[PDB]
Amino acid sequence: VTXWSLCXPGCTXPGGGXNCXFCX
Ligand SMILES: CCCCCCCCCCCCOP(=O)([O-])OCC[N+](C)(C)C
Ligand SMILES: CCCCCCCCCCCCOP(=O)([O-])OCC[N+](C)(C)C
Ligand SMILES: CCCCCCCCCCCCOP(=O)([O-])OCC[N+](C)(C)C
Ligand SMILES: CCCCCCCCCCCCOP(=O)([O-])OCC[N+](C)(C)C
Ligand SMILES: CCCCCCCCCCCCOP(=O)([O-])OCC[N+](C)(C)C
Numbered sequence: 001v002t003x004w005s006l007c008x009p010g011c012t013x014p015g016g017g018x019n020c021x022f023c024x
């Protein structure tokens, strides 16, 4: 899976509210 940046970025997380790893 190698992470680094594949562990979300592009997978959506707008920031309104929170609870999605980017915010969470
Ligand atoms: C800038 C682009 C960078 C690309 C880097 C190369 C990615 C090649 C595709 C890898 C797909 C499979 O991945 P994975 O089985 O979860 O990991 C590899 C795990 N082992 C080493 C133990 C087999
Ligand atoms: C590039 C480095 C990261 C690789 C991480 C791999 C983790 C193991 C994935 C195992 C599941 C294999 O199904 P996939 O092909 O993913 O399912 C997508 C198939 N369609 C396109 C037809 C919908
Ligand atoms: C019309 C063109 C069709 C041919 C090109 C598309 C081939 C199908 C996709 C190739 C595999 C891409 O796996 P990935 O996103 O690195 O794995 C993500 C793994 N998880 C879902 C578990 C996070
Ligand atoms: C002729 C065909 C050539 C194909 C070349 C494919 C290269 C894929 C490389 C994927 C590397 C995945 O990251 P890693 O293993 O943790 O980094 C290793 C970094 N060093 C080598 C400096 C230790
Ligand atoms: C043209 C742009 C050149 C940028 C050069 C920046 C300095 C790089 C120093 C080398 C160490 C850092 O990078 P790396 O762990 O090998 O890469 C993956 C980095 N991320 C985890 C954030 C995705």
Ligand SMILES: CCCCCCCCCCCCOP(=O)([O-])OCC[N+](C)(C)C
Binding pocket: 004
């Ligand atoms: C298929 C034809 C093209 C083959 C090209 C083969 C040579 C590729 C050399 C690539 C040199 C890149 O630097 P590095 O130290 O390994 O970065 C390591 C970066 N990670 C920590 C994110 C894994």
Ligand SMILES: CCCCCCCCCCCCOP(=O)([O-])OCC[N+](C)(C)C
Binding pocket: none
């Ligand atoms: C403008 C878009 C061009 C697309 C074509 C090129 C795609 C491949 C990018 C590969 C570079 C990604 O560098 P990184 O792993 O973050 O740093 C690695 C830094 N060192 C080499 C010093 C270890």
Ligand SMILES: CCCCCCCCCCCCOP(=O)([O-])OCC[N+](C)(C)C
Binding pocket: 006, 007, 008, 009, 010, 011
């Ligand atoms: C070019 C055509 C695109 C069409 C897309 C249609 C929806 C397919 C949904 C596929 C869901 C599984 O993949 P995923 O874990 O989200 O993908 C890899 C993303 N990350 C590296 C950030 C984990």
Ligand SMILES: CCCCCCCCCCCCOP(=O)([O-])OCC[N+](C)(C)C
Binding pocket: none
């Ligand atoms: C597509 C139209 C052109 C847009 C140009 C925007 C430039 C934004 C520059 C601000 C930094 C963006 O940092 P990031 O992407 O999160 O990290 C990339 C990290 N390295 C540079 C080391 C690879």
Ligand SMILES: CCCCCCCCCCCCOP(=O)([O-])OCC[N+](C)(C)C
Binding pocket: 009, 010, 011
């Ligand atoms: C894997 C595909 C993900 C597509 C996500 C599109 C969201 C709408 C962006 C519209 C503005 C142009 O785009 P960008 O801000 O330069 O790129 C997206 C950068 N993030 C992934 C960090 C948000």
Ligand SMILES: CCCCCCCCCCCCOP(=O)([O-])OCC[N+](C)(C)C
Binding pocket: 005, 009, 010
């Ligand atoms: C084989 C030729 C190369 C094809 C490459 C296609 C790339 C499609 C990118 C779709 C948008 C993905 O979101 P992004 O913000 O740009 O993701 C990088 C995440 N950081 C900004 C944090 C570094």
Ligand SMILES: CCCCCCCCCCCCOP(=O)([O-])OCC[N+](C)(C)C
Binding pocket: none
């Ligand atoms: C050498 C030529 C390189 C060409 C590189 C092309 C990169 C194209 C990246 C396209 C990323 C598309 O993801 P997205 O916006 O979320 O669409 C999927 C939207 N639905 C789930 C609603 C269907």
Ligand SMILES: CCCCCCCCCCCCOP(=O)([O-])OCC[N+](C)(C)C
Binding pocket: 010, 011, 012
């Ligand atoms: C002709 C040789 C190939 C050229 C390169 C084409 C690169 C196309 C990249 C397409 C990337 C598609 O986004 P993804 O994250 O996997 O979508 C999964 C669903 N979300 C966007 C919602 C997370």
